[PDB]
Design brief:
- This protein has 267 residues and is of the alpha+beta class.
- It is 30% helix and 24% strand.
- The protein is built from 8 helices and 13 strands.
- Strand 3 and strand 4 form a beta hairpin.
- Bound molecules: fe (iii) ion (FE).
- Fe (iii) ion binds next to loops.
- This is Isopenicillin N synthase-like Fe(2+) 2OG dioxygenase domain-containing protein.
- One of its GO terms (biological process) is antibiotic biosynthetic process.
Length: 267
């Protein structure tokens, strides 16, 4: 599979000028979505933070005082409506939701138990959530006039960090793939050929179209289908709108509100 270099070629988006740099990057990002099926930006300094956060997650995965299994999803308080946050034991991974970060009470306890990792995770979540909301504004700008705002929800969005680990697409609106520890993540292009973005140990983030946005755009943007081929840590932000909010669809340039909610779409 051909390597795809992105360092030094993707638009640069600085941590303290995110809104303005994403405005400047807008045309480059539109052209990536048109030309590739997924988007990319280089965020100087993001790699340092992600690598530290992942290394602290790896260390937490082996800790046996207030261990991570103590915060497995089935013993963590969950929202009445919404996805499932907490730790998923064994290949082993954690879902750090926006709700968890605001302690919505006791859901925040895994971050109190592992505050070094938890502080990095909250920091990465906030950066990733600002970036991905602006990616969503870019995609919205490519859709017909009258397209509603994506309304990605802070509390419904989650940062997944995977320890240890086929072609697939996410069910969410958008995802932001943060630089993983190792190479192997691969994306299919519009022509059906596979490429391997060079992202391990870089400052490059990728933005994935999810199947909610495929539905909302009525097939205009296919999901950013990808797979993972190895020879290990990875993190990704999965962004969702409010579960109770009403689905919509731009069909033939015309906005349509459906009876089903975004929560129904997931089921
Ligand atoms: Fe994935």
């Amino acid at each position: 599979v051909p390597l795809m270099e992105l360092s030094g070629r993707a638009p640069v988006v600085r941590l303290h000028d995110i809104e303005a740099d994403m405005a400047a990057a807008t045309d480059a990002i539109r052209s990536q979505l048109t030309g590739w099926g997924f988007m990319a930006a280089e965020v100087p300094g993001i790699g340092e933070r992600v690598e530290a956060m992942m290394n602290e997650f790896a260390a937490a995965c082996r800790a046996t005082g207030p261990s991570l299994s103590d915060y497995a999803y089935d013993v963590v308080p969950q929202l009445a409506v919404g996805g499932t946050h907490g730790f998923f034991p064994y290949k082993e991974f954690i879902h750090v939701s926006g709700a968890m970060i605001g302690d919505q009470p006791g859901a925040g306890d895994v971050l109190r138990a592992f505050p070094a990792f938890g502080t990095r995770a909250a920091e990465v979540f906030d950066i990733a959530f600002r970036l991905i909301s602006l990616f969503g504004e870019v995609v919205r700008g490519m859709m017909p006039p009258g397209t509603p705002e994506l309304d990605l929800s802070h509390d419904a969005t989650n940062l997944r960090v995977i320890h240890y680990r086929h072609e697939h697409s996410g069910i969410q609106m958008l995802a932001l793939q943060l630089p993983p520890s190792d190479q192997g993540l691969q994306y299919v292009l519009h022509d059906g050929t596979w490429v391997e973005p060079v992202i391990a140990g870089t400052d490059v983030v990728l933005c994935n179209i999810g199947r909610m946005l495929t539905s909302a755009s009525d097939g205009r943007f296919r999901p950013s289908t990808h797979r993972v081929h190895t020879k290990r840590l990875s993190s990704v932000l999965f962004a969702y709108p409010q579960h109770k909010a009403r689905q919509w669809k731009m069909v033939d340039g015309e906005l349509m509100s459906l009876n089903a909610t975004w929560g129904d779409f997931i089921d």
